[PDB]
């Protein structure tokens, strides 16, 4: 039918095959078609973003300073074919020609007060504070809050804060050379021990091992152990790479 | 038949295939149809919301400041394709075109005076008090009362208040790092003990374990126990990670 026939917050792409300038006809209206405004698709609803949600739209539209959707000399929509635009809660924005929906509408990303997101940047970019973000930096999203899902970052995994009970410690194994909470250089595979009571939130590098509990030392017993390598114990005694000594209640 | 023929609080969608501006014709009347007001469905009743009930309507209608159902330049109803509207007790509101009923009319949500709802937000939003609600926060609906079923929140489970009899205690296991009723940081898996007599309402994080009863200590007997880890008992005595001592009537 030559008459195209639109519901209210709907829009269709008219294929002006005198120019193929496919342009969104934001409804609603009894738009009339010559074969210079050829309709492409159906009156399907094309749902929008509910509050505090996000949708991933392929090939978004380039926007000027006033956030206006630009058109070129022939009237075709100015696109970002090789970009992405994270659309938060907003009106039923017209899907301009080229604008494809990669990910349909999805709920926002939530972290529990003691979980963390391994926020891996996939693409080099600059954060809002604007200091530096390398193409693949690792930074840990903190506890209670909500992250804004961006196109340049990827949530590889959710990191549950492993719990360090008293008389228990976490055998942390870094897989890259870096620092720790205390501040001494932690190298790859160097298993170190943190005794801070609580739910020690693992960093981007700490591979969590088993929770080692403190052995039980009454005056009836003494722990006979061998040092695997040079270090200084909690009491402040230098020990060699295999010297066997006793730790007691004293 | 060219005559459409409506009962009183009924309404039908007329498909103006000169514009397909499907618009609700709120009855009742002897509306007459050219093929520019094409009827879509039947005089089926389309029940409304009884008092203190709620219905979930897909694709609700956008409303202005005066809560008027808007129309666009061609007269098609202004919809919220990507939103929800919780309809409380109200009149037989016209189901405008696009407006679908996700959940049919259902009774309101009730909590017994000592049950609780694990109110999980599915979507990021702001509560009525307006401080902050992250996308997936956990807050416990309290006792005797009624919650308003919202689109942004989900009742995962009903939480029966587990009962702590005297000489009994609850072995609470948090699965996230957080605080407790007393106020000390409770980390994941750290089983702690609450001795407050009553029906201790479990929090959003407390996984309830078995109810441990107080052992029976007459002067005839003494409880010989070993401490699993460093702590301070109720009497205020530091105990090591395996020191075995006796607790008596004294």
Curated annotation (Swiss-Prot), chains A, B:
Description of post-translational modifications: Phosphorylated on Tyr residues after EGF stimulation. Dephosphorylated by PTPN11.
Superkingdom, taxonomy of origin: Eukaryota
Segments annotated as MVP repeats: 1-52, 53-107, 108-160, 161-213, 214-250
Signal peptide: none
Subcellular location: Cytoplasm; Nucleus
Subunit structure and binding partners: The vault ribonucleoprotein particle is a huge (400 A x 670 A) cage structure of 12.9 MDa. It consists of a dimer of half-vaults, with each half-vault comprising 39 identical major vault protein (MVP) chains, PARP4 and one or more vault RNAs (vRNAs). Interacts with TEP1. Interacts with PTEN and activated MAPK1. The phosphorylated protein interacts with the SH2 domains of PTPN11 and SRC. Interacts with APEX1. May interact with ZNF540.
Function: Required for normal vault structure. Vaults are multi-subunit structures that may act as scaffolds for proteins involved in signal transduction. Vaults may also play a role in nucleo-cytoplasmic transport. Down-regulates IFNG-mediated STAT1 signaling and subsequent activation of JAK. Down-regulates SRC activity and signaling through MAP kinases.
Domain notes: MVP 3 mediates interaction with PTEN. MVP 4 mediates interaction with PARP4.
Protein name: Major vault protein
Source organism per UniProt: Rattus norvegicus (Rat)
Designated gene of the protein: Mvp
Full-protein interval shown: 5 to 254 of 861
